[PDB]
């Protein structure tokens, strides 16, 4: 078949909607998420008009091969969607109602700056390319945009699923292209990061600071070096959950900063021992007593500064 | 073809059944399981009625393209099911008997609160969408619901496979949708968690408590810090088997609590050494002797409280 | 087409065979294995009989769509097999000879009780469902059962590939079902477990026992705790190669038992130090000297008991 | 169909273009990247020429099976591309305009010599094989070569996407083959390697050098051995992100060199202790004081030499 | 269609060739490699002979469904190859020239005895099964066997790609089967194993031997136990890259042997301490001084013996 012809010189308007049935597998490293959803399409084809009184039916059903259907695609998908047509309904004035159920793997960039206390705006870009015979333009039918109440994205809270109603119409390779932006707003469930990463990392750091109440060099070296190794393990664990970024993340900044605290603690432990061996313990004692206050204080202030810069 | 027309104005009833052939790959992190099963369908199509005496046959066989078949889907699947039609049988009054064998990857949420002593209710949601010409509604044929005796789900015990007989009828995108809930009740085989995670974690903790029978600071620091690192390793091992949850799991709560015991043990070991160096060993000895009882007692009471809150 | 009609009221016999071309990817955790094989089928269809003298040919060739073929399936496969038809030959009396080459992923439970010195019986279950017009029953053509000499399953020795010649005929959803059991007997190549897991695990344990020839508490704590951590690493390594079982495996039992030896060694090291500090070294020396014999002796006896219970 | 015949002796020119829609999953170990793109093709088929006045349309649309289409393939892809035809447009003189959207996994070798400060030239090779009746040759339509502004390759900066306009025409198996080279120039975002690998590795190394301000052998052995183990962990982490190369990478060279510094530091710590026990501390003190300067100086010079040899 | 009939009792010869376009993903653990290649086939079908003068064409082109094509398969593939037909050419005497491009995952056993200084012979087995009407036999057209100059197999050097010209003809299920052996000779790039595994493993071993220049038991235990743990880490790293073998590999033998050196070093360190505590240091000093020479000497001799047995 070929596209419906214009009454005059108007573009063909294709009304769209996406209804989310499942959202799963938000992969942070790949910056992808999987979706299973209804895609609804609506347009006018006057060649399909009929008389209700005469035909004795308010609606006709067609198979996809029998009529013209716009080639709708997703911009930001790995591979073309897996689609199954559910229904095609034609009303007497030639208004087509198309419904498919599809699944796809979507590429959408994530901003990790405030990880694990981050929020994201996932995008699903709908697109249509114009044909020689006619310009095709997309619109949003808001009554056919939504999500099922049970849609859960493990490790995330789903805030809203809306569409930017005005398309981005632009030229690509001498044809018009009409693009819509469907936006899925989500926020990370930071809860588990507290007992599993943040608090264990703070406990080992505070354990290293017990060295400031000890004159045993051998024990101090064991305290600071062992805890540092445990800190390295947490640093490695965290970076396996995340892609490499051309910026610092909030957690990355704290993790990095804690290395400086371990480094300065080793210097203090070394300086303390060196003075004692040199028969200057009163001086070592001044440095050690100051360290007992300076370490937790500088750690608290540095964290207030970091929280301020990031939030 | 198109749907069978009503004798009057009754909905079309599609009777369903699921017979489980295989259940495998319950993935805790993804909250998925794979299934291989029979789907049986039954409905009345009077246009297919025939005379047995005349035709000389009690049953007719058809191919799926020759007749009308309801578009049955699963709600909570990653991709549409892989289905192969096994048989279509039509009796003289036009009763169709449909049988397919399918495989699918099912999304079903898991409650990890009592992990690894948890039970789950897996769901398989069957669905059909109504057409303009007719409301289509699902029912359960209980004689065609079951599972093969050999179905094993590795790491789990299978309790029951039943269906909620009344469908959930509701409107979605201006059509009626009829949804059935097939429920697979399972309970986790907690056995291996005992020798592999729980007991080793208790042994290292009890080893750290030997420090309460030692005056050697250097040895004490080695005992408590080394065992803490081993505890971190078990914490990391456990969290790799589990998704991130917006709540505490029973194992997660014990693991987290044990960190506090390691932390207080380091404080005690530090306080003991500090007093001895200050020439107050009699006092250090009072704190150490009290710790020998306080640590195991507070550990037992805290575990009784946790078990009570979770079970 | 439809099934060949009975001369009287006999079931249709479908003769089967499986010839293994490749066996690969025995996955212990998933309890699966991949197979690539010939499936041979044979049955009588009298409607296809012809005269050899008249037709001037001993055999006719058909394409699968031209004739009736039984719907043969595998019970214990993840997804339906990937099949390609190789040949269909019809002899003058209407005997059909069918040959396909297929690949499949097979689910088959493994018994890990004697791991890594275990043997297994893998199963491939062939099945056919009877039709309304005729009962279909399976049989084994032993001349068409075997395996190629080069079939290798990495990490395993292949003993035999046989079929249980009598089918399991039973009712499932009001039709007869005919099931055959093809059995692939294999035994694990335990060799590499010796230099890679078993001996290293014994070496570190024996290294911990050097503490029974040392009065240095600090050194003893370092010896027993460090080796225990290495033992934890081997425990974790082993459990990553295995699924979770509702029973103890032989290796699992030894690994678990070794923890008790580490635990008692820490107690001995603690008791030794405590007595020396209390000015009772003669007594500490009695416990230490007894431990030098008791530890290796109790370890040898406990291993004889375990080997007896498992083998 | 078969290829359009020559007016007189000339090869058939197929004009090509690639417009990149998505670039993702640059896998360093596999030396692959995934691409989603438009492929545009243009050629003259005079057998498809038509009269606009007669046919009643100015352009004709066809399906791929209705006309002759050149067999265009990619050289360096794992499997044949997943392609969906978007449009086939024929103008009155028989000029065909072909447009498909495809996705593919591309093999392209990477040079890791300057990792993680490396740049790469990824290739997509387009190819066509000549037929008996006609030589087919490829060209670039520069107006149809480009990339969307949002194309992001996580962990990389995209510099340019251009084509080498002259094809490589050559004989393979007695036929002409026409090959085009599309080049995607990228540079690695080295940023995250600094806080995550490089600085932590320098901190632990500098911590080992505190041993040059200590006379405690026991503490020195703990300092140098513990930090060496942490260095091994970083070496292992880095090599998991990279393939095995028959040459040294810049990071690999620094990592390897640091082992020599740990080795010499152990020798120094051993020599120091040996002299002190032999009652030669004045001499040990000379070696230790020299080491305080020699270690950081030789480390700085060796790094200047390495940076010079690699950049 | 059906096979070309014999002039007189001679088998049909199918000439073959394989031209390698890409070799990738040699997976050591799975013993697989991926290939992308041309498969060329040639045979005589006299029923397709034509007169060039009469027909006015020197060559005819066909589609695969229009003529008889031999069912060529690969023996040692996971799944059937992904093939696309490029060209079918028929010359006037009825000589068919067939060309396809395919991709496949190939199973080929690897000999790890001399890992990582090993060479391998990968096999691609081509096969054809005879039909009732005709015996079919394979041959090699050497002019159509080759590889593109750019074919690279990451981590390997490609030496040669040749075919064993004489087929292996044998009976399987009462038909003749004709099998060709295409051989891809490769040698491992051992380079990176030196700086990444071999040298680090030697450095830690030599570090443990510093204990022979120390009288400090506590420091000695730290030196030998810490390095042993690092050795365990390298053993685990190496075994993750390799399948389990029923024989010792060269690297495996060195790794295993090094454990014995660590074990004897612990005995020496224990014996040294025991004698010193017993007031027999002169004797301890004799054992320690002998160990300084014995350890490196026995290590050198044992490595010469191992290299001799393996190479
Ligand atoms: C990149 C960061 C560099 C870190 C440098 C930190 C030095 C701080 C000086 C402390 C002042 C003090 O109080 O002690 C300084 C003492 C010297 O003491 P003295 O002069 O002999 O005693 C006083 C005698 N009267 C009576 C004459 C006054 O030296 C030390 O303790 C040595 C320990 C520092 C070693 C850290 C090494 C890290 C290696 C990294 C190389 C890249
Ligand atoms: C986050 C939780 C913080 C933990 C604090 C624990 C308090 C324990 C008080 C001990 C009571 C006691 O028995 O002794 C108090 C002693 C001081 O002894 P004295 O009073 O000087 O002697 C009396 C002399 N006459 C009788 C002759 C006059 O202090 C200590 O041993 C210091 C060791 C504890 C340090 C723990 C460091 C933790 C770092 C983490 C920072 C975020
Ligand atoms: C879950 C299992 C727990 C295992 C307990 C092992 C008991 C061994 C007793 C040895 C008998 C002996 O000979 O010495 C017992 C000695 C006391 O010696 P005394 O009696 O004071 O001296 C005699 C003086 N006269 C003769 C002059 C009168 O105390 C110890 O050495 C204590 C060290 C062991 C502590 C282990 C703590 C583990 C914490 C884990 C908590 C769950
Ligand atoms: C400490 C850990 C010690 C490990 C002991 C192995 C147990 C065993 O003896 O394993 C048994 C296996 C095979 O057993 P089977 O063939 O099933 O016997 C069936 C008997 N029925 C049917 C009567 C019940 O023999 C072996 O290959 C011996 C290799 C062991 C080498 C260990 C080197 C150290
Ligand atoms: C593969 C690299 C091997 C490295 C060899 C390093 C040589 C050290 C020379 C320093 C100069 C010095 O001053 O000390 C050298 C001293 C001997 O001194 P002395 O003769 O007793 O002193 C003078 C006394 N008079 C004046 C009375 C005569 O021995 C040591 O400290 C021993 C420690 C080094 C052991 C390292 C073991 C490495 C094992 C690895 C096996 C492959
Ligand atoms: C361990 C020692 C630390 C590693 C030193 C990195 C060497 C390097 O920085 O290399 C240089 C590259 C740039 O090189 P290019 O873009 O190829 O220019 C080649 C043009 N020439 C040939 C004219 C020079 O990195 C950078 O832009 C700067 C980031 C370095 C920060 C490291 C912090 C510590
Ligand atoms: C699996 C392999 C087992 C390894 C055993 C090797 C023993 C070497 C003997 C050295 C000869 C020597 O010179 O010293 C022998 C000394 C005893 O000396 P003495 O007679 O009391 O002294 C002389 C006194 N006069 C002169 C006054 C008479 O014993 C030791 O130091 C003991 C330390 C070795 C313990 C190793 C434990 C490993 C546990 C594994 C158990 C399965
Ligand atoms: C202890 C440390 C072990 C060192 C490993 C020895 C390697 C080897 O000996 O391997 C030898 C292989 C070549 O083997 P081939 O060509 O198959 O011999 C077949 C011909 N015949 C019949 C004569 C045997 O190549 C190499 O140049 C090895 C370079 C090794 C550098 C390691 C530095 C440390
Ligand atoms: C101890 C050393 C660690 C130092 C690391 C410091 C990294 C630099 C911090 C830059 C701030 C990044 O955080 C982001 O900034 C932009 C604009 O700046 C804001 O955007 C909303 C937000 O505040 C935040 O999402
Ligand atoms: C040491 C500090 C760690 C502290 C963490 C404490 C977390 C508090 C536990 C909340 C209990 C969650 O566990 C859940 O409770 C609800 C009712 O409330 C019940 O609900 C389902 O039946 C069950 O009992 C249990 O599945
Ligand atoms: C020190 C603590 C660890 C102790 C754990 C002990 C676990 C108990 C082992 C019971 C034996 C199980 O192992 C199985 O036994 C039965 C007979 O009983 C036999 O049955 C299979 O044939 C086999 O011999 C063995 O596969
Ligand atoms: C600490 C021991 C480590 C020793 C390893 C030393 C490696 C030697 C460096 C070889 C140069 C590699 O680096 C590469 O060389 C080529 C050509 O030489 C140069 O070009 O039209 C580049 O600068 C660089 O891409
Ligand atoms: Cl799409
Ligand atoms: Cl479905
Ligand atoms: Cl099947
Ligand atoms: Cl392609
Ligand atoms: Cl194949
Ligand atoms: Cl034979
Ligand atoms: Cl034959
Ligand atoms: Na259409
Ligand atoms: Na220590
Ligand atoms: Na139908
Ligand atoms: Na058929
Ligand atoms: Na075509
Ligand atoms: Na054919």
**Which domain CATH number covers E267?**
1.20.58.390
Distance E66 CA to ligand 20 centre (A): 30
- Name the phi and psi angles at B143, rounded to 5: -70, -20
Pick D31's closest partner by Cβ from E103, E154, E229: E154
How far apart (Å, rounded) are the C-alpha atoms in residues A102 and A218? 64
Search chain C and give the residue with CA nearest B20.
Answer: C75
Asked whether A103 and A121 are in contact (CB, 8 A), the reply is: no
Same domain, D132 and D38: yes
Whether E127 and E171 map to the same domain: the answer is yes
Q: Do A155 and B243 touch (CB under 8 A)?
A: yes
Method used for this model?
A: X-ray
- Is A274 touching ligand 1 by the criterion CB < 6 Å? yes
Please spell the DSSP secondary structure of chain D, one letter per residue. --PPPPSSSPPEEEEEEEEEEEEEEEETTTTEEEEEEEEEEEEE-GGG---HHHHS-SSEE--TTTS----EEESSBSS--EEEEEEEEE-TT-EEEEEEEEEEEEE-----TTTTS-EEEEEEEEEEE-BTTB-EEEEE-GGG-EE-TT--BTTEEEEEEEEEEEEEEEEETTEEEEEEEEEEEEEE--TTHIIIIIHHHHHHHHHHGGGGG---HHHHHHHHHHHHHHHHHHHHHHHHSS---SS--HHHHHHHHHHHHHHHHHHHHHHHHHHHHTT-HHHHHHHHHHHHHHHHHHHHHHHHHHHHHH-
Cα–Cα dist A291/B262, whole Å: 23
Helix, strand or coil for residue B181? strand
Which domain-ending residue is among A135, A168, A192? Answer: A192
Contact A152/B107 with Cβ under 8 angstroms? Answer: no
D256 & D277 share domain: yes
Determine the residue of chain D that is closest to A75 in CA distance.
D21
In this structure, are residues D95 and D50 in contact, taking their beta carbons and an 8 Å threshold?
Answer: no
Nearest Cα residue to E202 out of E165, E251, E273, E158: E251
Structure tokens at A278: 């040199």
Same domain? B223 vs B164: no
The candidate with the shortest Cα–Cα distance to D98, out of D130, D69, D131, is: D69
Question: Is E307 found in the same domain as E202?
Answer: yes
Strand partners of residue B107? B32
Cβ distance of A244 and D155 shorter than 8 Å: yes
Rg, C-alpha atoms of chain B: 31
Given a contact cutoff of 8 angstroms between Cβ atoms, the answer to whether D195 and D203 are in contact is no
List the structure tokens of A80: 């073309």
Testing the interface with E: which of D83, D179, D246 to mutate, by most E Cβ within 10 A? D246
Residue ranges in C38-168 assigned as alpha helix (H): 52-55
Specify whether C147 is located in the same domain as C250. no
C145 lies in the same domain as C98: yes
Ligand in nearest proximity to the CA of D128:
16
Q: Is the CB of D203 under 6 A from ligand 1?
A: no
CB count within 10 Å of CB B145 equals: 18
Q: Which numbered atom of ligand 7 lies nearest the CA of E271?
A: 31
Q: Which of D176, D192, D208 is the last residue of a domain?
A: D192
Comparing alpha-carbon positions, the chain C residue that sits nearest to E134 is C59
Atom of ligand 3 nearest to the CA of C287: 13
B164: its two tokens: 């909620």
Please check whether residues B109 and B221 belong to one and the same domain: no
**Helix H or strand E encompassing C264:** helix C250-277
Q: Which residues of E touch D245 (CB under 8 A)?
A: 189, 191-192
For chain D, the maximum distance between any two Cα atoms, rounded to a whole number of angstroms, is 113
* Rounded Cα gap, residues A219 and A216, in angstroms: 5
Distance from C-alpha of E126 to C-alpha of C265, rounded to nearest angstrom: 62
Same domain flag for E121 and E213: no
The closest of D180, D211, D195 to D273, measured between CA atoms, is D211
Task: From A138, A157, A192, give the residue that closes a domain.
Answer: A192
User: Can you tell me whether residue C16 is helix, strand or coil?
Assistant: strand
The C-alpha atoms of residue D278 and residue D22 are separated, in whole angstroms, by 70
Positive or negative, the CA dihedral A285, A290, A293, A294 is negative
CB proximity list for B161: less than 8 A, separation 6 or greater: B18, B20, B145, B146, B147, B182, B183, B184, B185
Separation CA B113–CA D40 (nearest Å)? 55
- Chain position carrying tokens 């990478």: D249
Resolution in A: 2.2
Q: What is the pairing mode between strands E119-129 and E72-74?
A: antiparallel
The burial class, CB within 10 Å (0-12 / 13-18 / 19+), for D143 is exposed
Distance C199 CA to ligand 20 centre (A): 69
Sign of the CA dihedral running D272, D276, D282, D283: negative
Portion 94-153 of A in contact with D at CB < 8 A: 107, 109, 129, 131-133
C206, C212, C288, C298, best to mutate for ligand 7 pocket (most atoms within 8 Å of CB): C206
Q: How far apart are CA C211 and CA B243, in angstroms?
A: 42
Whether residues E155 and D129 touch (CB distance < 8 A) is answered with no
| Domain CATH code at residue B91 | 2.70.170.10
Same domain, yes or no: D152 and D241: no
In chain E, residues with a C-beta closer than 8 Å to the C-beta of D239 are 196
Residue B194: CA count within 13 A, CB half-sphere: 11
Of C172, C265, C256, C259, nearest to C210 by C-alpha is C265
Could A36 and B78 be called an inter-chain contact, meaning their C-beta atoms sit closer than 8 Å?
Answer: yes
Residues A153 and A238 placed together within one structural domain of the fold: no
The set of residues, in sequence order, having a beta carbon less than 8 Å from that of C75 and lying 6+ positions away, is B21, C125, C126, C127, C179
Alpha helices in chain B (DSSP H): 52-55, 193, 199-208, 217-240, 250-277, 281-310
The DSSP element (H or E) to which E128 belongs, if any, is: strand E119-129
Retrieve residue E252's tokens: 């495996």
Is residue D113 within 8 Å of D310, Cβ to Cβ? yes
Q: E strands within A130-198?
A: 136-140, 146-147, 156-172, 175-188
* Contact (Cβ atoms closer than 8 angstroms) between residue E269 and residue E287: no
Would you say the CB of residue C296 lies under 6 angstroms from ligand 7?
A: yes
Instruction: Sort C138 into a burial class: Cβ within 10 Å, 0-12 / 13-18 / 19+.
Output: buried
On chain E, the residues whose CB falls within 8 A of the CB of D131 are 61, 87
Q: Whose CA is nearest to atom 27 of ligand 8?
A: E117
Write the CA distances from C94 to C69, C85, C90, D41, integer angstroms: 13, 19, 6, 53
| DSSP 3-state of B276 | helix
Closest CA to C128 of C184, C74, C197: C74
What are the contacts of C148-151 at 24+ separation with CB within 8 A?
C148/C19, C148/C20, C148/C21, C148/C22, C151/C20, C151/C21, C151/C22, C151/C23
CA–CA separation, A101 vs A85, rounded Å?
6
Other C-beta atoms within 10 Å of A27: how many? 12
* Residues whose CB is less than 8 angstroms from the CB of residue A190 and which lie 6 or more positions away in sequence, other chains included: A116, A117
User: How many residues are recorded in chain C?
Assistant: 311
Which ligand 3 atom is the nearest neighbour of the CA of C274? 31
The CA–CA distances, whole Å, from B24 to B29, B79, C239 equal 15, 17, 20
Q: Which residues of B touch C247 (CB under 8 A)?
A: 191
Nearest to A274 among D89, D193, D213 (CB): D213
CA-nearest of B216, B201, B176, B210 to B291 is B210
Task: Tell which E residues from 174 to 233 touch D, by Cβ distance under 8 Å.
Answer: 189, 191-193, 195-196, 199-200, 203-204, 206-207, 210, 213-216, 218-219, 222-223, 226-227, 229-230, 233
Instruction: Give bridge partners of residue E156 from the DSSP assignment.
Output: E153, E188
Chain centroid to CA D303: how far? 26
- Which residues line ligand 12 at a C-beta cut-off of 6 Å? D 113-114, 248, 253, 256-257, 309-310
DSSP code of residue A62: -
Q: Domain residues for C301?
A: 193-311
Question: At how many degrees (to 10) do helices B250-277 and A199-208 cross?
Answer: 10
Q: Which of B30, B132, B236 sits opposite A89 (nearest CB)?
A: B132
CA-closest candidate to residue B44, choices B87, B84, B98? B98
SS3 label, residue B100: strand
Residue owning tokens 């360290």: A291
Total structural domains in chain C?
2
C295 shares its domain with C228: yes
Q: Is E311 in the pocket of ligand 8 (CB under 6 A)?
A: yes
CA distance B222 to B211: 9
């Amino acid at each position: 078949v070929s596209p419906p012809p214009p009454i005059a010189d108007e573009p063909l308007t294709v009304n769209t909607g996406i209804y989310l049935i499942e959202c799963y597998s938000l992969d942070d490293k790949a910056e992808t998420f999987k979706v299973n959803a209804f895609l609804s399409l609506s347009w006018k084809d006057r060649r399909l008009a009929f008389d209700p009184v005469r035909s004795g039916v308010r609606v006709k059903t067609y198979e996809p091969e029998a009529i013209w259907i716009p080639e709708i695609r997703f911009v930001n998908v790995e591979n073309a969607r897996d689609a199954d047509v559910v229904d095609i309904s034609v009303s007497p004035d030639g208004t087509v109602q198309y419904l498919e159920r599809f699944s796809a793997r979507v590429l959408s960039p994530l901003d990790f700056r405030r990880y694990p206390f981050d929020s994201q705006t996932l995008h699903i870009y709908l697109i249509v390319r114009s044909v020689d015979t006619r310009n095709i333009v997309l619109a949003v039918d808001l009554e056919k945009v939504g999500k099922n109440d049970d849609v859960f994205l493990t490790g995330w809270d789903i805030e809203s699923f809306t569409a930017v109603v005005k398309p981005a119409n632009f030229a690509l390779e001498d044809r018009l292209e009409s693009k819509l932006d469907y936006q899925l707003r989500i926020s990370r469930q930071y809860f588990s990061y507290i007992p599993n990463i943040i608090l264990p990392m703070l406990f080992i750091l505070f354990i290293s600071w017990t060295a400031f109440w000890s004159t045993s060099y051998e024990a101090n070296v064991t305290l600071v070096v062992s805890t540092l190794i445990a800190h390295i393990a947490f640093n490695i664990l965290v970076e396996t959950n995340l892609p490499k970024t051309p910026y610092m993340t909030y957690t990355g900044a704290i993790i990095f900063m804690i290395y400086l605290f371990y480094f300065v603690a080793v210097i203090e432990v070394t300086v303390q021992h060196y003075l004692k061996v040199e028969s200057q313990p009163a001086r070592a004692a001044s440095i050690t007593r100051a360290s007992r206050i300076a370490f937790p204080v500088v750690f608290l202030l540095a964290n207030i500064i970091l929280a301020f810069l990031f939030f």
